[PDB]
Amino acid sequence: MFTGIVQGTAKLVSIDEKPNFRTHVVELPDHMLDGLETGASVAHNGCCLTVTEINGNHVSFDLMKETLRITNLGDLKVGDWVNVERA
Amino acid sequence: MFTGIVQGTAKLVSIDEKPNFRTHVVELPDHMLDGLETGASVAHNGCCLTVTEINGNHVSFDLMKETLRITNLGDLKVGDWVNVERA
Ligand SMILES: Cc1cc2nc3c(=O)[nH]c(=O)nc-3n(C[C@H](O)[C@H](O)[C@H](O)CO)c2cc1C
Ligand SMILES: Cc1cc2nc3c(=O)[nH]c(=O)nc-3n(C[C@H](O)[C@H](O)[C@H](O)CO)c2cc1C
Numbered sequence: 001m002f003t004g005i006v007q008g009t010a011k012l013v014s015i016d017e018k019p020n021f022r023t024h025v026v027e028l029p030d031h032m033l034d035g036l037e038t039g040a041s042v043a044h045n046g047c048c049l050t051v052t053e054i055n056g057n058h059v060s061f062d063l064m065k066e067t068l069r070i071t072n073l074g075d076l077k078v079g080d081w082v083n084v085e086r087a
Numbered sequence: 088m089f090t091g092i093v094q095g096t097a098k099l100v101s102i103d104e105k106p107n108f109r110t111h112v113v114e115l116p117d118h119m120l121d122g123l124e125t126g127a128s129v130a131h132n133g134c135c136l137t138v139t140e141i142n143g144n145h146v147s148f149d150l151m152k153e154t155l156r157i158t159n160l161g162d163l164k165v166g167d168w169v170n171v172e173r174a
Contacts, residue, residue: 002089004135006158046133046170048091071093072168081159083133
């Protein structure tokens, strides 16, 4: 799915804690928005996540508790930069 | 080459700045050491790097100027945890 050739960084502009998961909103680079549809896989810091929503260059993903515990995505704070790569 | 199923996190234990490049030494989880050889590829926060050295659990990578520029790996500090996945 992924080459490990990161295409750029994206700022975490938002974290919604909901009852069973977290939504991360990231601001993607313009050159990554082209042809991006909901359901597409983007790896965040190497972790595969599914696009749930697109508002402009603001892209949403839903993170389960297991993803948060196994990876460092549990420790991000708003304003952090994540490596991003579409598949 | 990578699936984006992160296999775990690795502590950045050492950063050795040189000319141009920068060596990162990370402490890999035990279950990732088996069969790991120099020249092998591991994605660090989604960024594919080549194993340059293995000493116990301590795995070295050399990070080139472009990699530091495109990714967030330039901002890491000793003690940070990185997502890691072997190919
Ligand atoms: C195609 C694909 C899509 C995935 N999408 C998500 C997701 O939206 N949210 C999530 O928490 N995990 C997702 N995962 C699992 C996530 O990548 C995995 O839990 C972490 O990498 C920890 O191994 C996905 C995995 C694959 C293979
Ligand atoms: C098989 C493979 C091995 C790579 N090894 C390294 C490496 O050892 N050091 C490095 O700085 N970049 C390496 N890269 C490039 C690096 O992944 C890339 O510059 C960043 O992901 C930013 O796109 C490699 C790329 C591939 C595809």
